[PDB]
Every structure is written in structure tokens, then in C-alpha cells.
Amino acid sequence: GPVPSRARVYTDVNTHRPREYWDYESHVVEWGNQDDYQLVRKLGRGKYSEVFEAINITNNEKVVVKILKPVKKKKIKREIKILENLRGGPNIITLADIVKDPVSRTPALVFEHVNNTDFKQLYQTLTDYDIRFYMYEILKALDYCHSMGIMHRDVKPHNVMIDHEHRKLRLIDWGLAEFYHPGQEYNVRVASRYFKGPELLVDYQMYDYSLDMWSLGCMLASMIFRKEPFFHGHDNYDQLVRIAKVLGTEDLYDYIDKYNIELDPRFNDILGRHSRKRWERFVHSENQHLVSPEALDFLDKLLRYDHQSRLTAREAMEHPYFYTVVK
Ligand SMILES: O=C1c2ccc(O)c(O)c2C(=O)c2c(O)ccc(O)c21
């Protein structure tokens, strides 16, 4: 059976915590007053909620209200407890209140307002310096949550809200996030296709914080190369093929062999044999102003098949890539 794995950082942070901290099933929600909030416009509907701009009539401040869909009941206190544990952390969206919605008969999460410009629009615009700046800001959020014993598990451009006027960033949508417990097996049906780590794509359940660094790597490749998404598979199987076209099949085998994992035999007629490519292969006239030797080396160090070999958030913030960014 599979060889076990553990995180190389913050391995035991929840084992030394009081039970209250990670046992979200036992959490008692503190409900505020639903009358304080007035919905103004619908912003989006996801798998698991509907999201509104709203106004808080006790301070007239703009807020965001997320009304949960009545499904997968356990996710609900998990998300609340994670948001309460991380509140006040660098670049972590601030849960301001929780109220009972009388129409949906579910919890509605009330957050601080962020005035995001659209990722597709905003990616078209980032300068070299701005990619580095914003990458550092996200790393702050990820190191904070990882050091608090939590993995986000859905890092992607849609979940990283940016107010480009005020140069301010928030990591949102903690509904897939989980507590890291050494040796725990996790569901591999997390993150969105283009951002799933190789561990997910080969059905390896004993993963950790390092999943988020694979996703961050995919976001970085998409920005510096100006190709959205960078690994563009048709489904979860083709997703691994597209990765193996860049990383190579020999290092994929080395990975699965290390953890004594077998690929789904459905890979037998689709995977082929591929060499590992040099990252320069993806550079052209239209993206070259976004690329540098430091950018390519930092990317190379995030996008590893072996989750254990990837830079930690802390180590990524140390990287030469960020030397040009003002502290
Ligand atoms: O602020 C959030 C926001 C803040 C916290 C969340 O957990 C969240 O899912 C969202 C969110 O989904 C969202 C959106 O879809 C569109 C515009 C937004 O401002 C947001």
C-alpha cells in the first residue's frame, strides 16, 4: 500500500492546540442580527453559496454577504471555525459577522468589503514588479494559514481578491480549507482542475500545505508566461498528461514510485514518454518583460511532482525573486 507522508513544516501545530481549536464539529456559532444587513446586488453563485454586495446599516459600511447553500452540512462549521481562527492574519479575508438567513434557512457569512478588479482583466495589466508584489502578498496569507495548522486547498485567481488602486489583496473562499493533522488521509476532490496538484491527480490522500504551493506555482506560470490557464487539461486525466508534457514522464514515475502509488491504468494509452522541458521554452516576445532568471528559478522550485520537494511558503518569501520588491 502507499508509503506515508508528512509536512516538513508546522507538522504538529494542531496536536499541541486545545481541542476547541481544530474540532469544528463542536463549535457553537455566535449569531449576530440579520436586520443589520441589507442585500444590494448579487455578485456570484458558486457550487456552495450565493454572494452579495450588502450594506451594514449600523455603520453604513459596504460588506459582502455569502449565503451558504443547504448542502454538505459539515463544511459549514469547518469554514466558520477556520475563518475565526485566522481572523486578523495578514491578507486573510475578515469574517465580520454570522447571521441566520430567514429565506434560505442557512448561515450567511458577512465579510469585510473588498473592491476587486476581475482577474482576467487584471492579469492582462500586471507589470513584472506588480506580479512579484502580489505574489509576496499571497505568500503572506499562505504562510500565516500554514503556520496556524490550515491548508486552503483552493488557491486560484478567482479566490485572490485584489484592490489594485489601494494595492491590497485578500485570500477568500475558505470553504474547502482543512486542518492539517499528520498522517490523516484527505479527499482528493478538492481545488479546481487547472490548479490540482499531482498528488490529487494520482489519488494520493496523505497530502499537506504543499498542495497550496503547487497551485500558487500554476498561478505564477499563468502570469509570467501570459497563458491562462498554464496547464490546460480537458479533464483530470488529461490534466496530468499536460503536466507530464512539461515536467516529463521519468520524474512522474520517480514520484509515484517513491510513494509506492500506481497510475490508473487508463493512463496506459494516453500518457506517452516525455522529456522534462527547460522553462525558457515558454518565453516569447509577448511575455519576455515578465520573465527573468529569478522568476524561472522560483517557478521551477514550486512546480515539483514531489509535494515534499516544493518550497514552503516561508522559503518562497526568502527567494531572490522578491529582492526587488520594497519591504
Ligand atoms: O468579496 C468576496 C468574497 C469574500 C469572502 C469569501 O469567502 C468569498 O467566497 C467571496 C466571494 O466569493 C466574492 C465574489 O464571488 C465576488 C466578489 C466578491 O467581493 C467576493
Sequence ranges of the domains in the chain: 5-22+114-327, 23-113
Residue 131 corresponds to which cell in the numbers above? Answer: 506580479
All residues at 6 or more sequence positions from 7 whose CB lies less than 8 Å from its CB, including other chains: 180, 182, 208, 209, 210
CA dist 110 and 130 (Å) reads: 29
Mark residue 35 as left, alpha or beta (left: phi above 0; alpha: psi -120 to 50; beta: remaining): alpha
Residue 50 marked ligand-binding: yes
CA dist 37 and 63 (Å) reads: 9
Q: Do 206 and 212 meet the contact criterion of CB atoms below 8 Å apart?
A: no
Handedness of CA 267, 269, 273, 274 (dihedral sign): negative
Tell me the sheet residues that pair with 55. Answer: 38, 62
Tell me the sheet residues that pair with 112. Answer: 63
Look at the block and give the residue holding cell 481549536.
21
* Cβ(172) – ligand 1 distance below 6 Å: yes
Q: Do 255 and 198 meet the contact criterion of CB atoms below 8 Å apart?
A: yes
* Cβ(118) – ligand 1 distance below 6 Å: no
CA 179-188-82 angle, to 5 degrees, is 20
Domain spanning 5-22+114-327: which superfamily? Transferase(Phosphotransferase) domain 1 (1.10.510.10)
User: Given ligand 1 and candidates 170, 173, 176, 192, which is best to mutate, with the most ligand atoms within 8 Å of its CB?
Assistant: 173
Phi/psi of residue 208, each to 5°? -155, -165
Residue 67 corresponds to which cell in the numbers above? Answer: 449565503
All residues at 6 or more sequence positions from 107 whose CB lies less than 8 Å from its CB, including other chains: 29, 67, 68, 76, 80, 98, 99, 100, 101
Query: What ligand 1 atom has the least distance to the C-alpha of 174?
Result: 7
Tell me the sheet residues that pair with 98. Answer: 109
Residue 27 corresponds to which cell in the numbers above? Answer: 463549535
Residue 45 marked ligand-binding: yes
Residue 258 marked ligand-binding: no
* Cβ(162) – ligand 1 distance below 6 Å: no
Q: Which residues are the active-site residues?
A: 154
All residues at 6 or more sequence positions from 308 whose CB lies less than 8 Å from its CB, including other chains: 5, 8, 210
Experiment type: X-ray
Burial code of 290-310, b = ≥16 C-beta within 10 A, e = fewer? bbbeebbebbebbbbbebeeb
In this chain, the answer to whether the domains covering 5-22+114-327 and 23-113 adopt an identical fold is no
* Cβ(154) – ligand 1 distance below 6 Å: no
Report the 10 Å Cβ neighbour count for 126: 18
CA dist 71 and 101 (Å) reads: 15
Give me the helices (H) in the chain, please: 19-22, 74-86, 119-125, 128-147, 198-201, 210-225, 236-247, 249-258, 293-302, 313-318
> Which residue from 97, 92, 47, 89 is spatially nearest to 72, judged by alpha carbons?
47
Residue 195 corresponds to which cell in the numbers above? Answer: 490548479
Indicate the fold that domain 23-113 takes in CATH: Phosphorylase Kinase; domain 1 (3.30.200)
The protein residue whose alpha carbon is closest to atom 2 in ligand 1 is 64
Helix (H, G, I), strand (E, B) or coil at 109: strand
